[PDB]
């Protein structure tokens, strides 16, 4: 019974693939590379639903010009199980069938092939076809081919990761990045930077990544998603080094730039790292997130962790770290939570500063469950050195004195901030009125 | 007005028995046993015994089940006789009787399905509202949140279709009790104050208790101007308060700035909310927030203040007030900065223009993020 | 109850008097307009779907 429904699904998917190829052809003809990006928005939906029957019929009809590509693509595809009602899907008619297929359409077909060979736990054949595709793309040189090439590199990286051979492709990615940054592509450059950062992280090679990021320049016109990936990797690399505040800022930018609905795992990743970094900064992250449904059970370790950091109890901190230890290690953060464990005092000292405008050092020692007040003295001095607190120590009376509040408005800060925002708004308008196309004479 | 079914006194006593420090009260236990024996709630007796590991009085339960079966069979027979010849009304009367008995004996699912069947058979908007109010009440007895929200939406839709306004005000009281339940104290205060002159839902609680809840929530949700212009002046809240010296003193102490007596009152109100069934969940938030509010009231008219002076005004020590003040300044609530070397509490309360500037930055940043996202999304 | 303007100073037994414009009535209007156009952007988004 379900076979007929599957058949109708296959027919509608075949028509949909026809539509994507039509869009790519229009883009290639009309000198509008962005028109492919329409063709490249529904890839996840297609992959989540593709089927062998659809793939066979598509490769059969579309590759009318029987070329070595066809001989390399068909054999992997399973043939129909004694199909009798075959309609012989024939997208290419007359001249179109005879003429060679467009580079972009062929690249897109190879992309569907590699995706299907990825969904199935069949990585060797997928990797083979992917190397072939990479060779093909590198051989050619075209614009809409470049736009598809972006996702082709993404999928080449995905397959190489699924085969755990991430190192071996570093040079290919590097040369591809070089050619891209030489040829003035934007999305390709963003993709190849992001992939290089992912490769560098996979092997915790942070110093090399730091040099790379510090030397290359992110093009200012990427997607939301490639911006999110770049921002996450830069945030992670900083947090691994000691520049906490910038890591916090870049992370929040990323979390504010991610897709709203999908990317549950991505949100999980950024949120856990944000929690850890803020904790490392002496602030207290807000409790609103922890009860969100998409991140409720994925952060319980961090919920207990913050419950511990506030009411600092090294017994409780050790209990929670030990129990949920393997998990922390799995996340890829353990090192940072350890960096916290010896900074549990900082929250308390920042609290003491916020609450009191001047306190005796002995009172601090009593409040922090410390030894002789010299230890608290030293911790406070180091703090003010770090910049976490604004104060001035004065022992001749024996009290640390917080600094008054300065009037931000009277200064010129407001002018600067509003100027930046005004510039952004005018730029939005110029872009918006530029994007218009009046083609009624199309 | 409407039948006292389910007796939410029963919900209150069940809760009280639930607390470890009230499990062993002979008077309360005997009162509940009398209630069960008087209304013969066999399923309720079984659920109680199960939860409490109470020895089952088989001798009594035998006759309990016997009578239950007798009444059930009688009601089904009356329904059959009505449906045989009688059309509508009498059949609806019998089905209402079945649902009512089922709810009385405490049988959740039986009474619930019966009320649903009555509703579907019922077309009288007054009777539809009676049914919905019964369903809300039973959803309260079992704290059935999903049932409660569904029933409230259903009632709102029927009432929006148009209905007797007595039932509108009854819906207001039910919504207010619910908002009290779910720690949305502001709506609770608003509805309770609006309906202070039209409390017809006596099945819920005594009028004294309705006003006590209204005052309790008003002093935490409203401000001093509104508090004066509603609570302390109102003819009603005063007329009733002639029989509740405690709540009257509690309110007036906060308002007149008798702080020591106000704390002495809040002490016992903590207990009067821990022992309660609808407030106990938020018994440690209400008192704490009220402490915030008093602290920010005393400090609303003092650039400086000696911690000794705070103590003598509150009749507490110095270490205690220091602890609480530092805690709440941590929480990011109160606006002041303690100084310990000299006991001064100098205020820091923020400027108006700067606050407006900061809020403009935050809100505009949110909006710009959205507009950028929207500009990008058109092409990808 | 905002009868007049100022605040005491305990301990020192002083009574300060001043004059404050607590609000400016040109930033409040701006904030309300920002909220209103947040609602308008939400509406455009809800109307951006048709494009997909």
């Amino acid at each position: 019974a379900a076979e007929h429904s599957q058949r109708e699904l296959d027919t509608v998917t075949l028509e949909d693939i026809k539509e994507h190829v039509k869009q790519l052809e229009k883009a290639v003809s009309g000198k509008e590379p962005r028109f492919v990006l329409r063709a490249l928005r529904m890839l996840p939906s297609t992959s989540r639903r593709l089927n062998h029957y659809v793939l066979y019929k598509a490769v059969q009809g579309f590759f009318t010009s029987n070329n070595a590509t066809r001989d390399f693509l068909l054999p992997f595809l399973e043939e129909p199980m004694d199909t009798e009602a075959d309609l012989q899907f024939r997208p290419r008619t007359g001249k179109a069938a005879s003429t060679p297929l467009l580079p972009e359409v062929e690249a897109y077909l190879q992309l569907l092939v590699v995706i299907f060979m990825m969904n199935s736990k069949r990585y060797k054949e997928a990797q083979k076809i992917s190397d072939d595709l990479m060779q093909k793309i590198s051989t050619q040189n075209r614009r809409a081919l470049d736009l598809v090439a972006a996702k082709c590199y993404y999928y080449h990286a995905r397959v190489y990761e699924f085969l755990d051979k991430l190192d071996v492709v570093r040079s290919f990615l590097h040369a591809r990045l070089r050619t891209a940054t030489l040829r003035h592509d934007a999305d390709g450059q963003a993709t190849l930077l992001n992939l290089l950062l992912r490769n560098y992280l996979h092997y915790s090679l942070y110093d090399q990544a730091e040099k790379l990021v510090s030397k290359s320049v992110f093009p200012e016109q990427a997607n939301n998603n490639e911006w999110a990936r770049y921002l996450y990797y830069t945030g992670r690399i900083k947090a691994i080094q000691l520049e906490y505040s910038e890591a916090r800022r870049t992370m929040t930018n990323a979390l504010r730039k991610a897709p709203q609905h999908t990317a549950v795992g991505f949100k999980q990743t950024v949120h856990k790292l944000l929690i850890v970094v803020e904790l490392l900064l002496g602030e207290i992250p807000d409790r609103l997130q922890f009860r969100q449904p998409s991140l409720k059970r994925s952060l319980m370790p961090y919920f207990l962790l913050t419950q511990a950091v506030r009411t600092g109890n090294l017994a409780k901190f050790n209990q929670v770290l030990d129990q949920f230890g393997e998990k922390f290690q799995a996340d890829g953060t353990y090192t940072l939570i350890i960096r916290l464990r010896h900074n549990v005092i900082k929250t308390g000292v920042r609290m003491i500063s916020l609450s009191y405008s001047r306190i005796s050092l002995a009172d601090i020692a009593q409040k922090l469950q410390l030894d002789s007040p010299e230890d608290a003295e030293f911790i406070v001095a180091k703090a003010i050195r770090d910049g976490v607190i604004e104060a001035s120590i004065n022992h001749e009376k024996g009290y640390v004195q917080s600094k008054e509040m300065i009037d931000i408005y009277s200064t010129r800060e407001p002018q600067l901030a509003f100027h930046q925002r005004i510039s952004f708004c005018l730029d939005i308008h110029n872009m918006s009125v530029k994007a218009m196309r009046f083609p009624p004479k199309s | 007005g409407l039948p006292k079914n389910p007796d939410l006194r029963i919900a209150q006593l069940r809760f009280l028995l639930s607390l470890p420090e009230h499990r062993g009260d002979a008077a309360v236990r005997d009162e509940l046993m009398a209630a069960v024996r008087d209304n013969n709630m066999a399923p309720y007796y079984e659920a109680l015994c199960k939860s409490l590991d109470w020895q089952i009085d088989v001798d009594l339960l035998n006759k309990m089940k016997k009578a239950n079966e007798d009444e059930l069979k009688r009601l089904d027979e009356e329904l059959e006789d009505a449906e045989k010849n009688l059309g509508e009304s009498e059949i609806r009367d019998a089905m209402m009787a079945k649902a009512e008995y089922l709810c009385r004996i405490g049988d959740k699912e039986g009474a619930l399905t019966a009320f649903r069947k009555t509703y579907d058979k019922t077309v009288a908007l007054g009777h539809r509202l009676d049914i919905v109010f019964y369903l809300l009440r039973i959803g309260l007895f079992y704290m059935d949140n999903d049932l409660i929200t569904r029933n409230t939406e259903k009632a709102k839709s029927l009432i929006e279709e148009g209905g007797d306004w007595d039932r509108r005000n009854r819906l207001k009281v039910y919504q207010g009790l619910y908002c009290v339940a779910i720690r949305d104290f502001k709506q609770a205060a608003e509805l309770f104050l609006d309906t202070v002159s039209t409390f017809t839902s006596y099945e819920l609680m005594d009028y004294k208790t309705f006003v006590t809840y209204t005052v309790y929530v008003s002093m935490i949700a409203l401000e001093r101007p509104d508090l004066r212009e509603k609570v302390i002046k109102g003819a009603e809240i005063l007329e009733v308060l002639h029989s509740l010296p405690a709540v009257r003193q509690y309110l007036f102490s906060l308002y007149e700035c008798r702080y020591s007596v106000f704390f002495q009152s809040l002490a016992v109100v903590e207990q009067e909310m821990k022992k309660d069934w609808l407030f106990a969940p938020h018994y440690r938030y209400y008192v704490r927030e009220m402490r915030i509010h008093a602290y920010s009231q005393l400090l609303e008219s003092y650039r400086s203040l000696t911690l000794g002076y705070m103590a003598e005004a509150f009749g507490v020590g110095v270490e205690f007030i220091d602890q609480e003040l530092s805690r709440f300044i941590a929480a990011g609530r109160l606006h002041c900065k303690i100084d310990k070397v000299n006991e001064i509490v100098e205020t820091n309360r923020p400027d108006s223009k700067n606050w407006q500037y900061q809020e403009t930055i935050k809100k505009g940043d949110l909006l710009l993020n959205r507009v950028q996202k929207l500009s990008r999304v058109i092409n990808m | 109850d905002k009868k007049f303007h100022g605040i005491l100073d305990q301990g020192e037994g002083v009574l300060i008097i001043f004059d404050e414009p607590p609000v400016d009535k040109t930033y409040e209007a701006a904030l309300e307009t920002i909220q209103n156009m947040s609602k308008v952007v939400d509406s455009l988004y809800n109307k951006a779907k048709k494009l997909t």
Binding site: R421, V433, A435, M436 | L368 | L51
Partner: peptide, 30 residues
């Protein structure tokens, strides 16, 4: 700043309307 925000929103709305009109014209034409 408020003025510029207003203007940006209006121009974006105009772009969206033009895009929708173009899409509708293409779909009707196709």
């Amino acid at each position: 700043y408020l003025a510029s925000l207003i203007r940006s929103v209006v121009a974006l709305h105009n772009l969206i309307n033009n895009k929708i009109a173009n899409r509708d014209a293409e779909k009707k034409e196709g």
